Ligand binder design. Structure first.
Ligand code: MG
Ligand code: MG
Lengths: 115, 217, 125, 48, 69, 79
């Protein structure tokens, strides 16, 4: 359940996310009819005095049975065209992403671990 | 004699018939697949079929932190940390896409809920993925692991020190001053343990179920 | 049928310059086959993807789901996900940067993954 | 020098709590001020 | 520097032989990529770094050429 | 077998190789110094020979060839 002004963690190898900054990134917009963002939802991120698109891959809110609940809200940065900003992901990613309506093949390619 | 929690009925105004009907289906699945005995705190490995992919299975290993539900809806939640990222999954025992349940290590802990492990140090939740099963002895009683974990800085997910939770597996002396402990005790509600109308005696119900389950065997 | 043999021949016909085919062990619950194809130009990439989807629709039938085309927004990387195969098409410059062959071949020994590290700190100092 | 400046920073009481988002969850790390601690130490050295 | 400098030569030989048998993929591309890896890394290396580098190559060989088909 | 055929056949395959410069592709052309080839370079040179001529040359003596005539002689006496 990510909302406007939520603080999120960039699970990626991109320099933009990796480099330490005095402020953690905050969500600015949720691309949904509702304002709530769940796994598989794009959002608009404010990073280092800049705006970038990003994708939610995990959160701390309970879901339906037999699905993984994480300890932090994890996000991945996405370019305007939709190509991933980073080249690697190390943290486990849920397998529900494969079938959900949307474009997730590109992110799945870069992710090693699936839980 | 270990009677699984789900078999015990909850109190209420429901008819007994609804429970008899549910039990018959529960026993039938147990013949097809065996459900091992375990308690909160034991480490388990569960194998389940993956729906998205075609005929490919999955395995998850973690410590059981909670047992809930009644009848065919019973659940259990087990936890582990992978690459320094904590994950929990809630499993239903009677879900038909569970291939096997393996008790890697059977043991009992001081409390019947370990949800406070979220606030403990990471080491107390990590378990080796490839750890092999340990031996068990039939002519014994289940072991009770008495470890007391250490906590991270005070801001926590819940106020575990407060008397309602009744936590007995945290080293409070290290994390809290004696002044704070007295501050917590203002929420005690001492009278609850001594009023005889809030107690649900299930000894007879437990006994009757035992023979019927054994008799059906 | 629309199998690995058919797909590679189809790619061969349409003149894919560089082709890599990687099998996937069951331990990873993603797909049986991973295929990466290089492409000269964006116009060429669109033609290659459209023909394969057209061919797949013709041969498949009965209870076989339809397949989406992804990456049309992007001008250089296109990927199509079939039931048991995954095909990625991109230009040479895009392919080398992401270096997808390395990761799947060397599952846990990839050089880029090794560069990433872990984080711990007692205090902000 | 880090340990002594930490004590002087605590002795000066100039500390800032920051919240760090980690894979295990957010934790409130404490950041003292080296600069303020150093300034107080210099005053004591200059004073008798 | 390596575990043995004969293993590096022996390891390189096996990779080329396995590539000869590669069927579906463009064998030429695989051969060129292997040479580039064998060229860039081994010119400059250290005991600890070299051991891991050759170790990763060793697993690549011992896993059906890392799944290449 | 034809020794002259072996010589030119070895010469032809070596000529096909691009990295080596055929400035002096004599029958006694050295590899470490005349052509500047490293341990990796010789192995592929051996493969360029084994591609159609040989196919059973071990590395133990392949590295010792160091010149077309030696390999010309070596393949000649093993077949
Ligand atoms: Mg309830
Ligand atoms: Mg809360």
């Amino acid at each position: 359940a990510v909302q406007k002004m939520t603080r999120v963690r960039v699970v990626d190898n991109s320099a933009l996310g990796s480099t330490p900054y005095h402020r953690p990134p905050r969500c600015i917009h949720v691309y949904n009819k509702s304002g709530v963002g769940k796994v598989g939802d794009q959002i608009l991120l404010a990073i280092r005095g800049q705006k970038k698109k990003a994708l939610i891959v995990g959160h701390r809110m309970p879901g339906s049975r037999m699905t993984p609940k994480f300890d932090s809200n994890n996000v991945v940065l996405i370019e305007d065209n939709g190509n991933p900003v980073g080249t690697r992901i190390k943290i486990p990613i849920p397998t529900s992403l494969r079938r959900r309506e949307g474009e997730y093949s590109k992110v799945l390619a870069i992710a090693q671990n699936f839980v | 004699r270990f009677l699984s929690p789900e078999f015990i009925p909850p109190r209420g105004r429901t008819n007994p018939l609804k429970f008899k009907i549910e039990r018959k289906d529960m026993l039938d699945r147990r013949k097809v697949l065996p459900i091992p005995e375990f308690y909160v705190g034991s480490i388990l490995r569960v194998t389940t079929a993956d729906p998205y992919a075609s005929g490919k299975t999955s395995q998850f290993l973690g410590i059981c932190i909670k047992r809930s539900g009644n009848g065919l809806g019973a659940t259990f939640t087990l936890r582990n940390t992978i690459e320094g990222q904590g994950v929990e999954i809630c499993f239903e025992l009677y879900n038909p896409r569970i291939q096997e349940i393996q008790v890697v290590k059977l043991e009992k802990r001081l409390d019947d809920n370990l949800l406070y492990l979220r606030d403990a140090l990471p080491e107390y939740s990590t378990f080796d993925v490839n750890m092999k099963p340990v031996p068990q002895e039939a002519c014994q009683e289940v072991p009770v692991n008495k470890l007391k974990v250490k906590m991270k800085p005070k801001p926590w997910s819940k106020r575990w020190e407060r008397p309602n939770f009744n936590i007995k597996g945290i080293r409070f002396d290290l994390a809290l001053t004696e002044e704070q402990m007295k501050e917590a005790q203002k929420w005690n509600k001492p009278w609850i343990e001594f009023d005889m109308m809030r107690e649900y005696d299930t000894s007879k119900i437990e006994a009757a179920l035992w023979e019927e389950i054994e008799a059906s065997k | 049928k629309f199998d690995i043999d058919m797909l590679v021949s189809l790619l061969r016909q349409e003149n894919a310059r560089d082709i890599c085919v990687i099998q996937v062990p069951p331990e990873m619950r993603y797909t049986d086959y991973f295929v990466i194809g290089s492409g000269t130009s964006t116009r060429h990439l669109h033609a290659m993807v459209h023909y394969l989807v057209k061919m797949y629709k013709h041969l498949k039938c009965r209870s076989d789901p339809y397949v989406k085309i992804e990456g049309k927004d992007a001008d250089d990387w296109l990927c199509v996900d079939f039931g048991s195969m995954v095909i990625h098409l991109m230009l040479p410059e895009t392919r080398e940067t992401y270096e997808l062959e390395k990761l799947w071949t060397l599952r846990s020994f990839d050089d880029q993954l090794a560069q990433i590290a872990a984080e711990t700190l007692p205090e902000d100092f | 020098i880090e340990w002594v400046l930490k004590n002087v920073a605590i002795k000066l009481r100039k500390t800032r709590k920051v919240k760090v988002l980690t894979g295990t969850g957010n934790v409130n790390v404490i950041q003292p001020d080296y600069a303020m601690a150093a300034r107080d130490f210099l005053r004591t050295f200059r004073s008798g | 520097a390596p575990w043995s400098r004969e293993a590096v030569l022996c390891l390189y030989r096996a990779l080329l032989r396995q590539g000869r048998e590669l069927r579906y993929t463009d064998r030429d591309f695989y051969f060129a990529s292997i040479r580039r890896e064998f060229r860039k890394n081994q010119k400059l290396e250290n005991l600890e770094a070299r051991e891991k580098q050759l170790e990763k190559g060793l697993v690549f060989l011992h896993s059906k050429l890392g799944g290449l088909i | 077998l034809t020794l002259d055929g072996i010589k030119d056949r070895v010469l032809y395959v070596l000529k096909l190789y691009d990295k080596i410069d055929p400035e002096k592709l004599s029958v006694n052309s050295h590899f470490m110094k005349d052509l500047g080839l490293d341990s990796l370079d010789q192995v592929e040179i051996i493969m360029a020979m084994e591609d159609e001529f040989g196919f059973e040359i071990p590395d133990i003596d392949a590295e010792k060839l160091m010149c077309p005539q030696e390999i010309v002689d070596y393949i000649a006496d093993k077949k």
